[PDB]
């Protein structure tokens, strides 16, 4: 149980066409919960919300250029 | 002001053979400690020390290819 989660709090402002990666780290022995880290255009890692249809919508804006 | 550190435990003991990739993260705003994670050959991540001169020991063994 050494290593821990890589997130703290959710982000309000979300820029659909300003992100690159989306590391979706599922629950593990380390972090008791899942993770949605995205990398920004400038290279700034942020965490997001799961519940809301964030990604459901964000995917398109990533896949369609 | 989110994004927590990945490491909580330093550790030094490890196999210089059974490993894949290693990275060092700079002391950022989100994470103040000097991060040193390494992806295991079996599918796990572990942390290391700064002043413990055993990180270099493994690096070299990977370039032997």
């Amino acid at each position, epitope marked *: 149980g050494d290593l821990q989660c890589l*997130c*703290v709090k959710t982000t309000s402002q979300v820029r659909p066409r300003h992100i690159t990666s989306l590391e979706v780290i599922k629950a593990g022995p380390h972090c*008791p*919960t899942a993770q949605l880290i995205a990398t920004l255009k400038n290279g700034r890692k942020i965490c997001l919300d799961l*519940q*809301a249809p964030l990604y459901k919508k964000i995917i398109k804006k990533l896949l369609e250029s | 002001g989110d994004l*927590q550190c990945l490491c*909580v435990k330093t550790t030094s003991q490890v196999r210089p053979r059974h490993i894949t990739s290693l990275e060092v993260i700079k002391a950022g705003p989100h994470c103040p400690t000097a991060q040193l994670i390494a992806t295991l050959k079996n599918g796990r991540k572990i942390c290391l020390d700064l002043q413990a001169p055993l990180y270099k020991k493994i690096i070299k063994k990977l370039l032997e290819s």
Partner: antibody
Amino acid sequence: VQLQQSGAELVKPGASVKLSCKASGYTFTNYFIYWVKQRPGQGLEWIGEINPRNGDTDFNEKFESRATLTVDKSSSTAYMQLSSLTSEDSAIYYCTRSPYGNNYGFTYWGQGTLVTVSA
Amino acid sequence: DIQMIQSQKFMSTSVGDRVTVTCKASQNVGTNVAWYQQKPGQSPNALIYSASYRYSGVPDRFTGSGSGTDFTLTITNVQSEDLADYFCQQYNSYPLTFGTGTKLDLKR
């Protein structure tokens, strides 16, 4: 143990009781701390939250006066006194934690401390 | 203060039964729900969050359902170990609110 707690005891109505809570790791300074008492007859009630970095809280309005939180960066410590007891303060108190700072449920809890009112 | 209405509080079922912990919201919380497991005379253990997403190291038996004002917790196969208590949660507005509890008894 990561979230230890204080001993169980009773006190007189209209008094003050000081609790204790310790943690292990950086999983203190960033994460929001929470306090809850177990009746256990009726159910569970929320007292409030408290930021470890700043000091800003946000108590429950019904049980605001019967509450006082002071977080000390000494050794990951979190205390709670009680401003004047009654008789309904008979509930076991917890020092809980949450995984995404101040949201997404309550992961770690702790042993607890049983408090009653009679004298 | 919102409160979460738990219709059933005292239930009982056999070895391997589908149980449905009824929990309806007074006002809207929006999926921000949590289920817990209180062991007899022990601290409530983290069960599941957002009536779908399960925590680390939680058996497949536990399953959440519903969204908004209506939520449901279901369980496929039960064992002697799974005998305890189960609570209800909402986390969208401070102060955050709990419930009442729903105990169960195993038939043997």
